[PDB]
Amino acid sequence: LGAKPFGEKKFIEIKGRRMAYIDEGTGDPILFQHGNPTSSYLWRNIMPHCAGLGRLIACDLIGMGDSDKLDPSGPERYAYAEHRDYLDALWEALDLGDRVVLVVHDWGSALGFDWARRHRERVQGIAYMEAIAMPIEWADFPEQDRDLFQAFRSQAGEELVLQDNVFVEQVLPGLILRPLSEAEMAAYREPFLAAGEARRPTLSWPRQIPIAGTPADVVAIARDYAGWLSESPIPKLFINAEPGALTTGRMRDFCRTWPNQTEITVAGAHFIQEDSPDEIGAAIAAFVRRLRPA
Ligand SMILES: [Br-]
Ligand SMILES: [Ca+2]
Ligand SMILES: [Ca+2]
Ligand SMILES: [Ca+2]
């Protein structure tokens, strides 16, 4: 529990942009990456469990958290390839070394799994949850939000997201089992208080999801790391959720097939970090300890 952020935000300029992140401690980094429509804040009650286990880092994706907005912004801004271009340069700047443990969720898993494949030699371990593990079909998508997501990927997505901020105000609270506090909702809605383009990142993300073959570039990237992950001996901690949301059904069947993997299930829907922060935190800290004996 806790509405307070973990650590203090530091800033660094990337491709003329300036991105925000948390960088606490020393040693090999334990990289936590949030997805849509959150920020580093999502890991505020989990990162504490890893204290003294390494350099704890949580980056705010471009256009998200305290990171700068891209401008001009529009229907083509914030696609996956653009977020990766900024995340790659941010991770390079932070001098992470070659024994990085990745802790990912949602789009962070898409970005994390991809970076991991491209930089496999540098990856010590991967702890993932409610992730985009492979390209999917609509039938694999959580039914309660299926029509809503098909709507984000239609001309109605602009009104829903840019005008009404649906992903932050409806999706987020809706996929967390416990009632959030006033301060916790403030921290999540802060980067998107302004109607219009400031919220563009939270609409471009659902349009990037590799569902029913589109978009093709993202599908290919996901087909890429899913293939790789299924055969990689890199240690993995799969934090499964009940009832879970995204990583259930076929995708979960698939993830349960990955090598050298430890699994645990915690209570939660999608943004499970809000429902079982300590169960998740404890597990990750244990995972890292076994990966870093001493
Ligand atoms: Br999304
Ligand atoms: Ca070293
Ligand atoms: Ca429908
Ligand atoms: Ca709820």
Side-chain angles (χ1 to χ4, degrees):
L1 48 160
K4 284 113 313 71
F6 176 78
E8 50 278 357
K9 293 291 189 55
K10 298 175 181 182
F11 298 77
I12 192 170
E13 181 259 305
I14 298 303
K15 302 177 58 61
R17 274 310 172 190
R18 173 174 298 86
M19 305 188 68
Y21 64 97
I22 295 170
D23 195 10
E24 300 295 313
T26 69
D28 289 315
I30 305 173
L31 206 40
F32 300 74
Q33 194 57 69
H34 79 267
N36 188 43
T38 65
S39 69
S40 51
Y41 187 75
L42 203 239
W43 311 103
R44 75 185 176 289
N45 301 308
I46 294 160
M47 294 177 91
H49 286 78
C50 291
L53 300 183
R55 188 178 165 207
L56 317 182
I57 304 178
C59 299
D60 282 351
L61 297 180
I62 195 76
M64 309 191 76
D66 295 306
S67 277
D68 276 7
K69 297 288 177 179
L70 287 183
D71 64 298
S73 181
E76 291 293 287
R77 179 76 71 184
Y78 298 109
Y80 178 89
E82 179 159 43
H83 262 110
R84 168 171 65 182
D85 274 325
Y86 280 87
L87 195 59
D88 275 12
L90 173 57
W91 284 5
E92 168 62 61
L94 294 179
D95 226 62
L96 309 170
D98 55 14
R99 288 292 79 190
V100 178
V101 167
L102 303 174
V103 179
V104 301
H105 176 228
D106 190 62
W107 275 104
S109 67
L111 288 162
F113 293 157
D114 181 47
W115 185 91
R117 185 181 70 80
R118 293 177 292 111
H119 306 82
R120 58 167 81 184
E121 304 293 309
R122 304 174 62 193
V123 179
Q124 191 177 63
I126 307 176
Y128 67 112
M129 58 213 80
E130 278 299 296
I132 301 184
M134 58 181 217
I136 63 178
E137 314 267 46
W138 279 113
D140 308 295
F141 200 79
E143 203 160 343
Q144 72 150 292
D145 282 288
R146 192 176 290 157
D147 290 0
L148 180 59
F149 272 69
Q150 310 179 321
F152 293 156
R153 298 155 65 86
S154 67
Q155 310 303 298
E158 270 71 18
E159 184 189 320
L160 287 163
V161 186
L162 314 191
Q163 178 182 116
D164 300 329
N165 216 19
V166 164
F167 218 109
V168 170
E169 311 279 10
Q170 181 187 334
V171 181
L172 180 49
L175 291 178
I176 298 179
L177 301 190
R178 63 101 180 183
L180 289 188
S181 85
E182 172 206 320
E184 296 174 322
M185 272 310 282
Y188 278 125
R189 95 157 53 76
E190 191 196 68
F192 309 109
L193 288 174
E197 291 309 316
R199 302 165 172 174
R200 177 66 66 172
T202 72
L203 163 62
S204 289
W205 271 138
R207 280 172 177 180
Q208 284 299 291
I209 309 178
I211 327 174
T214 287
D217 67 327
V218 177
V219 173
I221 288 173
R223 181 95 58 51
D224 227 303
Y225 58 61
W228 171 63
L229 284 163
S230 69
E231 290 312 82
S232 175
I234 293 181
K236 308 174 194 56
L237 168 57
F238 168 41
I239 297 175
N240 176 48
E242 209 54 54
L246 189 61
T247 303
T248 50
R250 289 207 298 140
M251 189 190 298
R252 178 154 60 189
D253 292 321
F254 176 56
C255 293
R256 270 162 176 160
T257 242
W258 299 356
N260 205 356
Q261 170 173 287
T262 281
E263 182 185 314
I264 206 299
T265 69
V266 308
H270 181 59
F271 306 91
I272 62 185
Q273 298 90 342
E274 292 302 348
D275 291 297
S276 308
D278 300 317
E279 295 102 294
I280 279 158
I284 301 167
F287 180 53
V288 167
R289 288 200 174 78
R290 292 198 218 71
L291 293 166
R292 299 175 184 183

